[PDB]
Amino acid sequence: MPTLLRVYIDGPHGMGKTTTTQLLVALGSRDDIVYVPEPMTYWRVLGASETIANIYTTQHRLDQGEISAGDAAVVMTSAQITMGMPYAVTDAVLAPHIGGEAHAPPPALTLIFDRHPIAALLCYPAARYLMGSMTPQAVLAFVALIPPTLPGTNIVLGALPEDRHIDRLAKRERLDLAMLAAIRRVYGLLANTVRYLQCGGSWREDWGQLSGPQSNAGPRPHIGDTLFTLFRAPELLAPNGDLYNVFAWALDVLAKRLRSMHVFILDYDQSPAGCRDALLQLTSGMVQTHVTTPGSIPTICDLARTFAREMGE
Amino acid sequence: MPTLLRVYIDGPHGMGKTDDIVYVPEPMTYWRVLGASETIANIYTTQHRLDQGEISAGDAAVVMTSAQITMGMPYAVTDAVLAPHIGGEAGPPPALTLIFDRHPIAALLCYPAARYLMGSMTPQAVLAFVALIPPTLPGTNIVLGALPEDRHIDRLAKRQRPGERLDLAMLAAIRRVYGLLANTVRYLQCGGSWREDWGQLSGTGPRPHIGDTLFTLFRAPELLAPNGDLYNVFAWALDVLAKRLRSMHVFILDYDQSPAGCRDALLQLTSGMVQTHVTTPGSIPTICDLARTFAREMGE
Numbered sequence A: 001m002p003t004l005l006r007v008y009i010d011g012p013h014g015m016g017k018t019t020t021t022q023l024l025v026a027l028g029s030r031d032d033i034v035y036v037p038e039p040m041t042y043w044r045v046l047g048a049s050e051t052i053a054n055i056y057t058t059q060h061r062l063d064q065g066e067i068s069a070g071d072a073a074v075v076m077t078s079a080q081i082t083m084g085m086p087y088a089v090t091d092a093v094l095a096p097h098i099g100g101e102a103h104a105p106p107p108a109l110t111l112i113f114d115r116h117p118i119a120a121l122l123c124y125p126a127a128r129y130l131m132g133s134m135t136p137q138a139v140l141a142f143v144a145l146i147p148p149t150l151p152g153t154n155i156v157l158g159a160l161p162e163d164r165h166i167d168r169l170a171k172r173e174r175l176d177l178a179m180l181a182a183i184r185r186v187y188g189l190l191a192n193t194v195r196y197l198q199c200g201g202s203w204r205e206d207w208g209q210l211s212g213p214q215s216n217a218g219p220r221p222h223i224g225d226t227l228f229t230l231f232r233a234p235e236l237l238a239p240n241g242d243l244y245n246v247f248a249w250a251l252d253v254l255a256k257r258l259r260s261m262h263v264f265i266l267d268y269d270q271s272p273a274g275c276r277d278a279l280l281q282l283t284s285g286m287v288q289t290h291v292t293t294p295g296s297i298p299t300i301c302d303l304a305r306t307f308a309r310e311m312g313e
Numbered sequence B: 001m002p003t004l005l006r007v008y009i010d011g012p013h014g015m016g017k018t019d020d021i022v023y024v025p026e027p028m029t030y031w032r033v034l035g036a037s038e039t040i041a042n043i044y045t046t047q048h049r050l051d052q053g054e055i056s057a058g059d060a061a062v063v064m065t066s067a068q069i070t071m072g073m074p075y076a077v078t079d080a081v082l083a084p085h086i087g088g089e090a091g092p093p094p095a096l097t098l099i100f101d102r103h104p105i106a107a108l109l110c111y112p113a114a115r116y117l118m119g120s121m122t123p124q125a126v127l128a129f130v131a132l133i134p135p136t137l138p139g140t141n142i143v144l145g146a147l148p149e150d151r152h153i154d155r156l157a158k159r160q161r162p163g164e165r166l167d168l169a170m171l172a173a174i175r176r177v178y179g180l181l182a183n184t185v186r187y188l189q190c191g192g193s194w195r196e197d198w199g200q201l202s203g204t205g206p207r208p209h210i211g212d213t214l215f216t217l218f219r220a221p222e223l224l225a226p227n228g229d230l231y232n233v234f235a236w237a238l239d240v241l242a243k244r245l246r247s248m249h250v251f252i253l254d255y256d257q258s259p260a261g262c263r264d265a266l267l268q269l270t271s272g273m274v275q276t277h278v279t280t281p282g283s284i285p286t287i288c289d290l291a292r293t294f295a296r297e298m299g300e
C-alpha cells in the first residue's frame, strides 16, 4: 500500500509559481518528487505555432476595433482547446493509477504540476469571457469537458497584491492589465466557489439571490462571490428568465468537478525562498491517495519524467 | 436496483438515422440558436471558402475547431450528468432503454478527424478533442451504419440540414473515418497494440492491419519530431484513444432498406447489447427527466 501526493500549482500567471515549485523540487530527493512543468515546447511549437502570441494580439486588435467579437472568439476558443491539451492528456493517463484517499506516513512519490486542467478548461476561458473575446456558451462547453476530478486533487492557488502583481508582471504576451484584472478575479471566484460547495452551497437553491478569498477556511460565501455569478449572461437565459437546461446542466458539472477539490492558498508576496518554505508547510495538510497497482509508482514516475523531458523550458 | 440499456445511434450522417424507452434527439436548436448562430452553415461555408481559395488553411482551422466545440457541447454535458448514474454490467428486459442520437465520439473524434482529412483542422486539434473523450462506461453500445456510397449520396441529398452544403469530399472523409473507427475497435478488441505495430505504417489475434485503423491518421507530420518519432504527448493521446475505443460495443445497422426494416433491424441488434445497473433508486426517473427535457429544449 504505497501512497502518492499530487499538488497542482495554479492561479494567475506572473506571481512566481514556476520558480517556487522548482525551488521546492530542488529540496527533494531526485527520485521522490517529480515536476510536470509548463509544456512550453508543446506550446510554441508542437501543438501549433506560437500559441501565446496569437492570443495576446487578437485581444489587442479586438480592443482597438480591428476585428469583431465573433472573430476574436473563434481565435480565443480554438487557442484554448489547443492550449489545454497537455493537461488533459496527463490527467487521462494518470487516472487509472489513482486509488482512494489517505496524518499519514511520507508519500512514496510526490508529483507537482505546473497547472491543473481547470486553468485551460475553466479559468482562462472565463477570463476571456470577461474581456469580451469568448462567449459564455463556449466557456460552458469547456466546463462540460472538464475531466472527472480524481481523489486527492490538491490545488494551490496564489495570493498577491495587484500593485505588487502589476510590478512583478512588468518584466518584458503583452502588457494587458484588463486581462490581469480579469484572471485575478476569476481565480478569486474559483477559491470562493470551492468554499461555497464544501459548505453545502447548492447553486440551484441560491440562483435567485443573484442580481447587480479563502478556499479552505471561513464561512460560506454568497453565490454572488462565486463563479456561478458569471453565467447570468442574457445569452444563456431563456424567454422565461431562467437558464436553458443545457447551461444549467453544465453548472451542475462545474459544481461536481469542484466540490471534491482540496484548495490551498499560498502567499507569493515574499522572496522566492520564502514562497518555497511556505509551500512546503502547506503540503503537510494536503491529501494523499493510494495507487491502484504496486508498479504505479515507477510507472507514474516515468510518465512524469518523460513529460518534463519532452515539454519544459 | 434497476437495469438500463443505453444505445447510441451514430455513424456518418445522411444514411437514415433521423414509456420504457426514451429518445434523446439531435440538438439542432443548440446548433442553430442556443450555442451559437447557425453552426452548421458556418462549418459548411468555411470549408467552401477554403476550397475556393478565399481563406487560408490556418484561418479555416480556427473556425472549424471553435464550431466543433459548439456542436459537441450537448453530448458532453449529457455524458457528464449521466455518468454518475451508471453502474456495473447487469447483462430480462431493461427498466429503461435510452436511445441517443449520437455519442460524444462523433464530436470529439469522428467529425474532427474528417475535417483534418478535408484540410480544415490540424491533427493537433483533433488529438486535443480525443484527450477530452469521456471515460467509457460499462454498457456503451454504439450503432454504426452500413450503406453503399451512391445510395448514401441519394439519401443525403434528400436530407440536407440547415446550412449544409452537399459535399462529396466530406462524405467520403466521414465515411472513411467511420469505417476506420469500426476497424479500430476490432483491432483493439483482438489485442492490437498500436505502439507495437506503429512501424508497419512507416515502412511495411487476427485483426485489421493498423493501416486500416484510425491510428494511421496520426502519422501526420505535424505530430512527429525531426527523427520521425511521434511526440510523447501525442502518443499519450493515442493511448487514451485505444482505452476509450476498446471497451465500446459496436453494432452495425444495415441502412440499405426501409424505415420499417431499419426500425426492426435496430430492435434486432438490441439482443446482444450490454445492460448496466443504475447506481440509485431514483436514477431511472432522473435519467428519464434529463432525456425528455433535452428533447424538448434542444430537439428540432
Ligand SMILES: C[C@H](O)Cn1cnc2c(N)ncnc21
Binding pocket: A013, A052, A080, A083, A084, A115, A119, A120, A121, A124, A125
Ligand atoms: C502563460 C499563460 O497565461 C499560462 N496559461 C496556462 N494555461 C493557459 C490557458 N489555458 N489559456 C491561457 N493562458 C494559459
Ligand SMILES: C[C@H](O)Cn1cnc2c(N)ncnc21
Binding pocket: B013, B026, B040, B043, B068, B071, B072, B106, B107, B111, B161
Ligand atoms: C449536422 C449533422 O448532425 C452532421 N454533424 C453531426 N455532428 C457534427 C459535428 N460534431 N461536426 C460537424 N458536423 C456534424
